[PDB]
Amino acid sequence: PQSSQVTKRGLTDPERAAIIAAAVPDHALDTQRKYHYFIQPRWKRLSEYEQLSCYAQPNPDWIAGGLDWGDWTQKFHGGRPSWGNESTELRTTDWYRHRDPARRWHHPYVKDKSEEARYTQRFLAAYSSEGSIRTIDPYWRDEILNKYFGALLYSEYGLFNAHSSVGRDCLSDTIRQTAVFAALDKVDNAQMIQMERLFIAKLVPGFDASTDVPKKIWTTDPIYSGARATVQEIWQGVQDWNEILWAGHAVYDATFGQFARREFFQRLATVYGDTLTPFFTAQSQTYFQTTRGAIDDLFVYCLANDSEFGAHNRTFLNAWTEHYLASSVAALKDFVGLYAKVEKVAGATDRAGVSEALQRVFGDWKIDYADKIGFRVDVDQKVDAVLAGYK
Amino acid sequence: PQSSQVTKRGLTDPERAAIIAAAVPDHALDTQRKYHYFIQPRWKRLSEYEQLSCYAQPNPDWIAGGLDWGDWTQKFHGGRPSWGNESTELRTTDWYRHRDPARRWHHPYVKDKSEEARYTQRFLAAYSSEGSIRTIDPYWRDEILNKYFGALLYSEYGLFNAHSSVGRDCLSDTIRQTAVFAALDKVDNAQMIQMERLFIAKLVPGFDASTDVPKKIWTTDPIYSGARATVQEIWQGVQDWNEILWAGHAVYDATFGQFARREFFQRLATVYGDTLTPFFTAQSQTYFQTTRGAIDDLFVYCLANDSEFGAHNRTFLNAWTEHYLASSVAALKDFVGLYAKVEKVAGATDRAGVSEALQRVFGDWKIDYADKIGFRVDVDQKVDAVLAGYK
Amino acid sequence: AKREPIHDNSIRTEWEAKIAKLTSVDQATKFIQDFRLAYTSPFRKSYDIDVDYQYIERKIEEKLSVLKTEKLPVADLITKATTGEDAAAVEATWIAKIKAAKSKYEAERIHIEFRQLYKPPVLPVNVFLRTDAALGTVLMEIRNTDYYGTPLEGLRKERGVKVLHLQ
Amino acid sequence: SAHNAYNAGIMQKTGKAFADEFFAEENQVVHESNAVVLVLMKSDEIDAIIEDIVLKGGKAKNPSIVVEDKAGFWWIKADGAIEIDAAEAGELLGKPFSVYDLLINVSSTVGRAYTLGTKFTITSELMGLD
Amino acid sequence: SAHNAYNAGIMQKTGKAFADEFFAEENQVVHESNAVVLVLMKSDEIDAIIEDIVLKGGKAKNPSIVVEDKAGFWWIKADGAIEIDAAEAGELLGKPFSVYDLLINVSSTVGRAYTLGTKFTITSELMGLD
Amino acid sequence: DALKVNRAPVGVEPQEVHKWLQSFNWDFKENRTKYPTKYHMANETKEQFKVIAKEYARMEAAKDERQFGTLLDGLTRLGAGNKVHPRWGETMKVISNFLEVGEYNAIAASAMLWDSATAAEQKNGYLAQVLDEIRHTHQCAFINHYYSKHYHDPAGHNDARRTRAIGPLWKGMKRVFADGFISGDAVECSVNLQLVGEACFTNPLIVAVTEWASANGDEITPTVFLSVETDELRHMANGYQTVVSIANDPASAKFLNTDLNNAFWTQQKYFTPVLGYLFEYGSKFKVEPWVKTWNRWVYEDWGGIWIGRLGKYGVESPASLRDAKRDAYWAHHDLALAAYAMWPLGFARLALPDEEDQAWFEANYPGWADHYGKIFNEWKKLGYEDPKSGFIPYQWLLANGHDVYIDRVSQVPFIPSLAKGTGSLRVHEFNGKKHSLTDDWGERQWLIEPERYECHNVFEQYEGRELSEVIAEGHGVRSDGKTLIAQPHTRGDNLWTLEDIKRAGCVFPDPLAKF
Amino acid sequence: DALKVNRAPVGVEPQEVHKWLQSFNWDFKENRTKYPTKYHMANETKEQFKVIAKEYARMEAAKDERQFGTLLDGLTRLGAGNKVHPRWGETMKVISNFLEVGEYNAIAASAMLWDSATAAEQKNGYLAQVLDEIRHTHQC
Numbered sequence A, B: 001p002q003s004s005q006v007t008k009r010g011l012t013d014p015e016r017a018a019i020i021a022a023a024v025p026d027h028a029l030d031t032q033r034k035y036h037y038f039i040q041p042r043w044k045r046l047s048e049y050e051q052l053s054c055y056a057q058p059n060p061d062w063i064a065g066g067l068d069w070g071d072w073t074q075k076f077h078g079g080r081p082s083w084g085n086e087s088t089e090l091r092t093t094d095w096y097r098h099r100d101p102a103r104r105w106h107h108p109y110v111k112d113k114s115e116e117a118r119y120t121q122r123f124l125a126a127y128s129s130e131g132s133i134r135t136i137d138p139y140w141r142d143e144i145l146n147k148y149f150g151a152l153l154y155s156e157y158g159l160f161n162a163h164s165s166v167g168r169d170c171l172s173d174t175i176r177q178t179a180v181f182a183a184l185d186k187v188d189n190a191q192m193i194q195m196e197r198l199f200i201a202k203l204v205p206g207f208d209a210s211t212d213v214p215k216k217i218w219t220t221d222p223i224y225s226g227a228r229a230t231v232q233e234i235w236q237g238v239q240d241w242n243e244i245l246w247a248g249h250a251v252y253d254a255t256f257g258q259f260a261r262r263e264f265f266q267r268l269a270t271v272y273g274d275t276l277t278p279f280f281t282a283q284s285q286t287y288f289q290t291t292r293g294a295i296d297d298l299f300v301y302c303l304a305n306d307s308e309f310g311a312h313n314r315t316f317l318n319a320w321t322e323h324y325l326a327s328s329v330a331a332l333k334d335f336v337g338l339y340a341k342v343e344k345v346a347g348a349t350d351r352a353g354v355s356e357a358l359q360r361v362f363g364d365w366k367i368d369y370a371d372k373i374g375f376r377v378d379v380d381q382k383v384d385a386v387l388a389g390y391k
Numbered sequence C: 001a002k003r004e005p006i007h008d009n010s011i012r013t014e015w016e017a018k019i020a021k022l023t024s025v026d027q028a029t030k031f032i033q034d035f036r037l038a039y040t041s042p043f044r045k046s047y048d049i050d051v052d053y054q055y056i057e058r059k060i061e062e063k064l065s066v067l068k069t070e071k072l073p074v075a076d077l078i079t080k081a082t083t084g085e086d087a088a089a090v091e092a093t094w095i096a097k098i099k100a101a102k103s104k105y106e107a108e109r110i111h112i113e114f115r116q117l118y119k120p121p122v123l124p125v126n127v128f129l130r131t132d133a134a135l136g137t138v139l140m141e142i143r144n145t146d147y148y149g150t151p152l153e154g155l156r157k158e159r160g161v162k163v164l165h166l167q
Numbered sequence D, E: 001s002a003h004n005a006y007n008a009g010i011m012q013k014t015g016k017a018f019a020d021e022f023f024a025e026e027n028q029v030v031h032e033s034n035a036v037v038l039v040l041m042k043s044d045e046i047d048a049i050i051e052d053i054v055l056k057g058g059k060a061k062n063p064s065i066v067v068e069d070k071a072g073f074w075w076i077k078a079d080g081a082i083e084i085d086a087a088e089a090g091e092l093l094g095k096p097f098s099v100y101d102l103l104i105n106v107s108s109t110v111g112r113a114y115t116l117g118t119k120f121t122i123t124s125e126l127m128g129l130d
Numbered sequence F: 001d002a003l004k005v006n007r008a009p010v011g012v013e014p015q016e017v018h019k020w021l022q023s024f025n026w027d028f029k030e031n032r033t034k035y036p037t038k039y040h041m042a043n044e045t046k047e048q049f050k051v052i053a054k055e056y057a058r059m060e061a062a063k064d065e066r067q068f069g070t071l072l073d074g075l076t077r078l079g080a081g082n083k084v085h086p087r088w089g090e091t092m093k094v095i096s097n098f099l100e101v102g103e104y105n106a107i108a109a110s111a112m113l114w115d116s117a118t119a120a121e122q123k124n125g126y127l128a129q130v131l132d133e134i135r136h137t138h139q140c141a142f143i144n145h146y147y148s149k150h151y152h153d154p155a156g157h158n159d160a161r162r163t164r165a166i167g168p169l170w171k172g173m174k175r176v177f178a179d180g181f182i183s184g185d186a187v188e189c190s191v192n193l194q195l196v197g198e199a200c201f202t203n204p205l206i207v208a209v210t211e212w213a214s215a216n217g218d219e220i221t222p223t224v225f226l227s228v229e230t231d232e233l234r235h236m237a238n239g240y241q242t243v244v245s246i247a248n249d250p251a252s253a254k255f256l257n258t259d260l261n262n263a264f265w266t267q268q269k270y271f272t273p274v275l276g277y278l279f280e281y282g283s284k285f286k287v288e289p290w291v292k293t294w295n296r297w298v299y300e301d302w303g304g305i306w307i308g309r310l311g312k313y314g315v316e317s318p319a320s321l322r323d324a325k326r327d328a329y330w331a332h333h334d335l336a337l338a339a340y341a342m343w344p345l346g347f348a349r350l351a352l353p354d355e356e357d358q359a360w361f362e363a364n365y366p367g368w369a370d371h372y373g374k375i376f377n378e379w380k381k382l383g384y385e386d387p388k389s390g391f392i393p394y395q396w397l398l399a400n401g402h403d404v405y406i407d408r409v410s411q412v413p414f415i416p417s418l419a420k421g422t423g424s425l426r427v428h429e430f431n432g433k434k435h436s437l438t439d440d441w442g443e444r445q446w447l448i449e450p451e452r453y454e455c456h457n458v459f460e461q462y463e464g465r466e467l468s469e470v471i472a473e474g475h476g477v478r479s480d481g482k483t484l485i486a487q488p489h490t491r492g493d494n495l496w497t498l499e500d501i502k503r504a505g506c507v508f509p510d511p512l513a514k515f
Numbered sequence G: 001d002a003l004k005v006n007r008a009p010v011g012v013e014p015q016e017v018h019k020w021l022q023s024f025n026w027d028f029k030e031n032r033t034k035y036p037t038k039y040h041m042a043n044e045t046k047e048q049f050k051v052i053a054k055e056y057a058r059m060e061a062a063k064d065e066r067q068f069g070t071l072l073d074g075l076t077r078l079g080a081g082n083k084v085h086p087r088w089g090e091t092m093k094v095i096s097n098f099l100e101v102g103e104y105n106a107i108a109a110s111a112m113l114w115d116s117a118t119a120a121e122q123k124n125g126y127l128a129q130v131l132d133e134i135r136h137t138h139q140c
């Protein structure tokens, strides 16, 4: 016996359901049942991803693409609009144009990451039972992986916080979903790196999983000097939300981020008997490739080729790319000094093997990004600049 | 319209819902709401795994543990019962005693494997886009991995078909689920290997993913001669369903299987720059430890320590282990001739490396299975027996 | 006749005491075959313990099996029947027997009797099951030959039943 | 197309009328039927496939298709064959939808069923014998 | 526990009587409440937690707990704090049930809420100021 | 190269792996089935729904999430568990747990097909079938687990895996879709389990019942059963492939018509009357006459689309069909007489047909009123529902010469003095044991294969024992130790107790002793 | 050692990672919020629901599967979409869509709290809130 009323349900209560059925007409009052039918579809047909995302942001007509009208209801002191064209140097005819090629709305994004979340714990319970850690090279495990791969977590964490202003400032819904999903994948990468260090600490006595040494290395070791500087600038030096996304993902994470994760820690792990690290980098690489598809569509399909502002946008992207490629080339030059600490393996850690690694990162980037915005780059020159840091 | 009645739903139709509500008593007719409350819980409280599984098999009292009575309604020609004690040498006071420690009924088992199924495809899409196969050792890839890791899928397929009679003959529900789950994971291992081979074919022109060379190696190459003999025996030479589960998972797969999958193809992958194979062995290894937990409970907790038949059961387990360990030692003896083909890596493919790998497999096997059934095993003796096949 | 309770009755108690006097493999083998020849199959010698013989037989199996692991050498568990016969010999003996049967009624008897005599733990399980399958294959083919050819009245005579009532 | 109604033929009779045809001599052996029966489990995806595939395009190619409302599922009977392309359903629903995602709510099949490419098919043909 | 009913105090009155108290002078500023309000989404897991955790062990320790049925959710109000141990819910439900699995159906909180170990706790305490 | 590779995003689709599955098998001398079989023809078929292990799991997992979402979240928030009519809620105790044993045996039966198949694709396919039948076991289990938590009478839902041993209806369930599958020729399982069990009877048993549950307020069963049958289309396909091999080989085709007829009669002998009874008598609202549900799904559709189509390839219409249609009209009314009369041995609360049920019964089955309606009405006037009446119909049946017999083969009860279904009592004595057979198909099976059919029946086991002693030994009580699970009414007051059963003085006889 | 190692089954729990979350931030001169604020005090707080990215997705994916099972399977089979009183069905046009824009703005407002936060636990916590509001937008 409760004080309030037990509310009868219109779906099942016989009296209310009868009243409801009597009131519902015996015919549809319109035949258009495609939710937000008026969205221009990017693909052969309109997708649930687009129906649920597109035009959620209430932009007015004075923000290119907006279907509304009038000024904002409330603005910052001084008059900064809730969302405004002043937020980025880049221009387009329609900020809604962007489409994640993965078509991630919230549900599929967490559905996928939950599969990875649950499978990882299963893999670790089995990996501990397997004792597979016994064949890992101890110097690699203790002096390179534990110290400098753990230091790398701060680059990922720094890229993650670079999105904080992007998530507030950017000007369309699909762009905002791309940025925020990209940001979670970056803090995940940082958390996942620390998870692995915690995991190894349970299997190897004396393996110190504390972040003190990694942090000391990230903040003071010349190996990460240029990397920290680029990250601190991308994250806190600029607020152009397009510049952050471009410099962070298309320049820094595509060159330094790719060389560190794929060419160094993942690749060398399969040269030093590390059966564990490739399980973790497999996730950071999958996240990178998924982020890149969305970043690519924003800056290539939409921005660099916008019918009216493509050449205008390419001017800023080329200026940005010139600047942050310098900061990344400097970050790599500092990074390749870590090869002086690793035991030399033929074709992997010698001068020839580092060059083939550098040629891969700069070569892939020229195809994936530079060719698409008109940025010219001599790959051999970039390799030689970094290799000047090899000893 | 339609010829038949659009029958009205009793849950929402006002008239039928009113009739129903009038006939449903305003009070419960019993207070026991725990489905199959009389199951004896293995753990602190009865688990949903146990509630849905235990006593599904309609066993009579003359099969140890049964709650039913009488003879079966229909038996084989000659009189073989639907299920009977004649199906295995092992004895117990209660065949229902077994409990998968992972507590897998059908739904959690496919939920967990669905994750691996979807994540794998995302990982493969990213890995191909990464171009990470470029750093792999071409000889390892084409002459060892393609041919010999491919040939190993027949060992897994063999161990999968070993369960067909097991799924028909075993005498309780939790054992049957343990068996069937163990088998699906094994054909999965066989399928995952061929999936990796088909994937590399898409990345490396000239890389042949046909099973012809793997099949020719499995069926004629002396490297797998001992392994194929043991598998053909476990699969088709015996019908004691307890002997199949024991010889398959606790002896052969725990020694030869563990060495081929973990000490060879997964360990050497991380020594020849293979960033792809460890992603697939990470799954078979997880499958192995999850199968081991269930297998370990059936034979150690339930059978080797049954209050009346423990010592009786150890007698048969000892004889089986003696027989099938010799088969697996000979299988490993033929298998270590493969090290003659691989490129020499210090501490991995030399005699000291193979010895340490053999010590790990037999050392782990003594602890995990032998010591629990009273089987004596000179680990040094087994290691030197296999090392005799190393050039 | 009034039945005692299903799972605990004086009849089962009495045979369990009878079973506990078995102290050798040869004694338990003679005891289990005499039991199976007298109380199992449609050609059993008595139905006096119909509702109990299956449980009792299980307890006989449990006694003989324990005796085997206590007393027999390991090789005998794998390759010989508790009668001392060579297990492989028993398989060929009985396969060729039922294959030489001239009717489903000779065939069904040979197969039934094989089970009565050599059902585990007498014969090793692996040898028993594949022999039981071979016999069952032959019995099944001869029975499913012209299955509906003999009318019921003839099938009753051929089976040798006494017809007590036909509605 | 009335012959493929759930209540076609004898199913329409009641009482003695039904009993007389049911026990009629000619109706004591099975009669070869050229039809198929496909049961679709009601859900958001299936109710969209039923209206916009089976009853639009599907019934255009095969006028004999009969779809009946059985509360929890759809009862479909048609002469010859019924086909459903998972690709066409995926475009209709705006989300990935392979053949196995189609099979999520395909309950029963009275006929020969198979999957070729992206297409589920239930056919009256006897593959291997015809 | 009458003060923690959904229709306690002014909520009992109707018409002019409710209006007279609603616009009363004393009732134009907030009044400090030592209570907490928990909202649980009605599901299979939550209906069991309500009946065997909140209303048994929870109400024994805190007799001021009031649970009200609101069609789709449970409305719980109690003095001081309400705690639900997910480990106790796991035993009760017989399936894995971490504290984040409890939060699947813990909708709203009026109070300070946190997770300490396997326990979810909503409390009227002001951590950081008290 | 070390610098140049195609970086287009690719994976490996399921059918790319499945294309190579046939090559996973290899030839050795011992690569043959372990189980006896008459069918030795070549059976190198292709699995119709090409499934790999990962894809199997992704597909089935997707079904579960939608199913358990509906049950655990939505229908629970609606309180749908207690919105079922009592008659139907009681019926689901029997239907679900009985089907569960069939799914459980179907695991094993599918394993034999797995063992006895030769093509690597069909081994991989039948393992998936084996997985499915485990899924089906846990699904049926989940219905009763769900009813136990949310339905107003958890007794019977909560403990059927032991309280089903008490009564005679459970015995025949151990054959129809259980022993009949797994205790015989392994390749014949493609005929009994698949061509007949799965292609014919799962449709009315698992799909058609969904509409009856919806009519009676049960939205739990459709949520689960409709998801169960989505696995069966893959099973029918796999089974049909083997049947093609048998019909195309003259040596093994001469065993096909007989096994089909035995399989069809084996399964219909029980399924027809028992499911008919549970549908028409265990419901308040009826969808359609059971005999029309049977005519639609069994005679016309399965008979025509499967057996009639195959008729062009030697497959005959089953010789037991005429007898089976007669059972479809009347046998479940016969079965109702026995089920109502022996209600204390069950685990469900039954409801005598009320005045409007009787009108319906007599309208669709003319004659029902004078034959069955009069008996049911007389039982009500004798106190059938009143626990103080000291009346239970089984004793009444013996007083009026309506003796009840158990078929030695099918375990189906038979009351020859009241039965209108197919049947006649044949009582044989053989080797000192009396046997009662009930039809020409079961008797022929027993006369030719007596060592296969030695099942003890309830009278042989309970002989001379008082009814309430049997019930209490078999745990047929609620939690208070004295009130029966089974009841002869579906109200909430005046439930029968053990002492109420003892007052009636019912003791089990030897029905064959008079012969 | 290459032969001896603890082979007990272990993983790493959410709270074990989240313990080290505060150390993920480091000091530099420009490490402050980019937005205007009147509040320049120490906000070195703890997140009361220790959340990491993998666990955030697992928890929300679990909510989603039950919600979409109910909608796409259960309620659709019951036709509940047209069992709403017309008055209320119309009201949901504006309630759900107006709530949508409030959820959409909450994405951005959380991102401001993300940027203005100084503790790594609250920076991480506010990104979880940013994703929650994207979830709520697609839910509305």
Ligand SMILES: [Fe+2]
Pocket (backbone or CB within 6 Å): G103, G106, G132, G133, G136
């Ligand atoms: Fe929100």
Ligand SMILES: [Fe+3]
Pocket (backbone or CB within 6 Å): F103, F106, F132, F133, F136
């Ligand atoms: Fe099934």
Ligand SMILES: [Fe+3]
Pocket (backbone or CB within 6 Å): F106, F133, F198, F231, F232, F235
């Ligand atoms: Fe099936």
